[PDB]
Enzyme design. Structure first.
Site, PDB file in Angstrom:
ATOM      1  N   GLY C  12       0.817  -1.226   0.000  1.00 47.22           N
ATOM      2  CA  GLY C  12       0.000   0.000   0.000  1.00 47.22           C
ATOM      3  C   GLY C  12       0.835   1.253   0.000  1.00 47.22           C
ATOM      4  O   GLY C  12       2.022   1.204   0.251  1.00 47.22           O
ATOM      5  N   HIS C 155      -5.315  21.879   1.141  1.00 47.18           N
ATOM      6  CA  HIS C 155      -5.172  20.470   0.757  1.00 47.18           C
ATOM      7  C   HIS C 155      -5.406  20.279  -0.726  1.00 47.18           C
ATOM      8  O   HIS C 155      -5.921  21.170  -1.400  1.00 47.18           O
ATOM      9  CB  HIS C 155      -6.151  19.593   1.510  1.00 47.18           C
ATOM     10  CG  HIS C 155      -5.708  19.237   2.885  1.00 47.18           C
ATOM     11  ND1 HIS C 155      -5.951  20.032   3.991  1.00 47.18           N
ATOM     12  CD2 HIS C 155      -5.031  18.157   3.333  1.00 47.18           C
ATOM     13  CE1 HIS C 155      -5.455  19.442   5.057  1.00 47.18           C
ATOM     14  NE2 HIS C 155      -4.925  18.286   4.695  1.00 47.18           N
ATOM     15  N   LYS C 159      -9.378  15.872  -1.738  1.00 44.56           N
ATOM     16  CA  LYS C 159      -9.743  15.755  -0.346  1.00 44.56           C
ATOM     17  C   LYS C 159     -11.232  15.983  -0.134  1.00 44.56           C
ATOM     18  O   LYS C 159     -11.758  17.028  -0.582  1.00 44.56           O
ATOM     19  CB  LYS C 159      -8.907  16.707   0.529  1.00 44.56           C
ATOM     20  CG  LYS C 159      -9.249  16.635   1.997  1.00 44.56           C
ATOM     21  CD  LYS C 159      -8.040  16.343   2.859  1.00 44.56           C
ATOM     22  CE  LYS C 159      -8.375  16.410   4.337  1.00 44.56           C
ATOM     23  NZ  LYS C 159      -8.746  15.077   4.871  1.00 44.56           N
TER      24      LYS C 159
END
Lengths: 263, 265, 266, 266
Positions: C12, C155, C159
């Site tokens: 991952g 961000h 997001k």
């Protein structure tokens, strides 16, 4: 060059008195105010700590005949009254007042046939330069860049976002073929989700004694391009207004601030 | 959709180029070159980047260029000049991000550009190249009574100060104001400096952490500040510009640079 | 001598950065690399996609890997993490839990497991974000009269939530220190005639754009000055480096801890 | 109820901001306005240029300001302040001394005067700058391994010395917390092949431009994140607000104190 300053005791007008002194080709001639303000019968530069050599007056008739240019950053309604007397005496006028009537706009267009006028919402050299460059930046960065306008002002500011912030948005939207009323976002709360590519976001800060901080952000995978203007005091607007006054050497007609700057 | 080959596909910059080709709607990866004796030959181009491109990492320059419209090369001068001769042969366009060519090498690119389309540029970031252009306009408008400073931040491993970008920003601003960079640059301040001379172009350099590359040009006067800023987030800055240059040059002949790609002529 | 660290979810996005973080730290070495069975990456070296030859194969054998490990670091999902936690208790191995979204029953199981092993369970593993929370408490108390508080946050475009968990936690620390209620005094955007700002307001300005990992600033503003406390993340390594530091710290300990304990801010 | 505060040098640049600071604080009240012997603005209202109606004529008679006052605030020179201090000690009044660069004899005179009265003597009066110094100590200790430290500073074009006294003091607090010597590890500029930066270096980047009052940032950077602590001064109100707060704080104390004591940072 003889320059008159309207609202001479007010917050904006005192900085204009300093701006005329700072600029060489200029000297202070007039100082108008409201009929009934305590202002009258005091030296124009006494607030700032100079000896003006001119009394603050309430004589629109008398003062305009001596002065070559008038600068007005007052409330809108008295400005149209100030404009009328300025036409008569063959005197130029710099109009700093904003938030103006639709029928009032036509009065300045008609008055521009008689004398020279520079009509602008914002008088800062830096802010006007920023408007110009955002057009170029938006066109180059037209695919895959997210546009945000971040803005900060003092706690007493009533309207959000500022006239400047919205005008920045209009220039960016206009260059990208977008409609600002359709694609603006003014805040985010909860699951705003993925950002739509078309969105122009506005983030507004209200705090402390901030004079006026504006940033236009362009962001993509890999980079960020930021165009920022920061005002340190009201002198930014005064310095531009005096420069616009110098620029109208007898000229006739209506001009944007982009004309004085050569843009 | 335009077929793109990536040289040095397993290297750090080649892996970002694989993502850049994937991300762009008009482009698709057609080949992925690496030298012979790479541990990655035979593997899918996207094996470390979460993509199934369907293209094996190859060392066969002949077979891969026969299936490609454009080659993007950020490797070394000797392998790039070798790739350039095979690009002329096949009529493939070439994006050269490689640096450190000599005068012989630069002449070879100029000659090759008569036969095929080339974008040869020192920096491939769209935003840095745009910044250079705008500083010319900003400098001329703000030419009386504004102090000019160039603030710059890079990672701890950076050897040169200021960066090539920071110095090039200074050259654009100096050239627009009629000043000479050698005589008016200042790279630090220690002790009793006195008042700042209006003509000075100051450089403040930050070296810290893992900063990819942060650049700001500041113009300051009594009353206001104008800042033009660029911030690089990763190597994707250069990859995304190279892919844009590939799209732009497709089916052209001649030598070009990023100023041509962004329409700033 | 070196600390033996196992990484869960090793293929991952978060697991790959943790492989680099374990390598980078001088007194730790990678001892195992777990992934679920039927991963495409079983058999391959843990470092295959980050340019390392770690010399450990990516495995699905939780039992065999935890037998050779001092600590496990887990940023996966609650069901696999609770399964890993049971094997960690059995083999006497410490665990760093970066996973979010536990039930109360899952949370109770972590409390019970902490009688038998060392656990660091935290919502955020960044050293700088956890430090920021602590100092905002001090800054809010000193600057408690006549300073306007704004939380500015930036961000990436993908997001989903605004403002971030971090931005809201910053607000909770500042509100808690000033005796304010965040639900009553927060503002999330400003449009039109806002009027003058109320002294009690904690404003939140949120930017969503590009590939920004996470930029957070707490602003304190009054007549005359501005104090800004700022944290900027460059990548996922911020969380990995803190998790590895939590692994080093909890070695030879039992009980339940969080990042405040690891940084010595309690 | 409100506290009675007197202002020295009320026509000077610093005293004008102090008049506004005294109003803006809710439970303080202006009692007096002293000025030097034979000024050009005696008789005029104290808030005559600063925009409010104090109801007090500017005097150059020590007696009135010494009486019917609880606290005196003084940002003048060494000579007048020591003379004011003699009259202040006699009349049982507190004093906030904001003059900087005392003589060695003058510093000793303040020490013995503090046995009879309450004194707040400090190099910087800003609440935010003094708070920044405190926090940098905490941040440096937590971020003591693997973080590069830089101090970025910006001032107006007329500033003669680089870096500022504040910037250097920030450096001293960070160096002192990390056990480093500032003279040994400071760097003030970079030109040419600086090479890969030494972990021990504390870098200083100084900006001189325009009309910048004073911008200071302390940067802490590592692989994965950045922590920035920033202070920005908007005007001289920064210092005035802290002096008025020091006056409130010393509302029945006797002795020598500094801003660390006023803000409860011991």
């Amino acid at each position: 060059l003889k320059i008159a300053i309207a609202g001479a005791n007010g917050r904006m007008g005192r900085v204009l008195v300093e701006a005329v002194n700072n600029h060489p080709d200029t000297v202070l001639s007039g100082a108008l105010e409201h009929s009934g303000s305590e202002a009258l019968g005091l030296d124009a530069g006494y607030a700032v700590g100079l000896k003006t050599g001119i009394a603050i007056s309430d004589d629109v008739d008398a003062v305009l005949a001596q002065s070559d240019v008038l600068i007005d950053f007052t409330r809108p309604e008295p400005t149209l009254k100030h404009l009328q007397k300025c036409v008569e005496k063959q005197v130029n006028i710099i109009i700093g007042t904003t938030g103006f009537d639709d029928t009032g706009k036509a009065a300045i267009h008609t008055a521009a046939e008689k004398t020279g006028i520079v009509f602008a919402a914002n008088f800062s050299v830096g802010v006007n330069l920023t408007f110009h460059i955002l057009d170029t930046v938006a066109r180059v960065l037209n695919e895959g860049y997210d546009i945000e306008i971040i803005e900060g002002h003092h706690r007493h500011k009533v309207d959000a976002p500022s006239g400047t912030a919205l005008r920045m948005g209009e220039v960016i939207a206009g260059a990208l073929g977008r409609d600002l009323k359709q694609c603006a976002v003014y805040g985010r709360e909860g699951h705003t989700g993925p950002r739509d590519p078309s969105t122009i976001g506005f983030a507004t800060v209200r705090a402390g004694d901030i004079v006026g901080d504006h940033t236009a952000l362009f962001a993509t995978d890999g980079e960020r391009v930021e165009i920022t203007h920061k005002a340190s005091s009201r002198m930014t607007f005064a310095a531009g207004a005096v420069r616009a006054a110098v620029w109208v050497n007898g000229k006739t007609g209506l001009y944007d601030m982009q004309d004085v700057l050569g843009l």
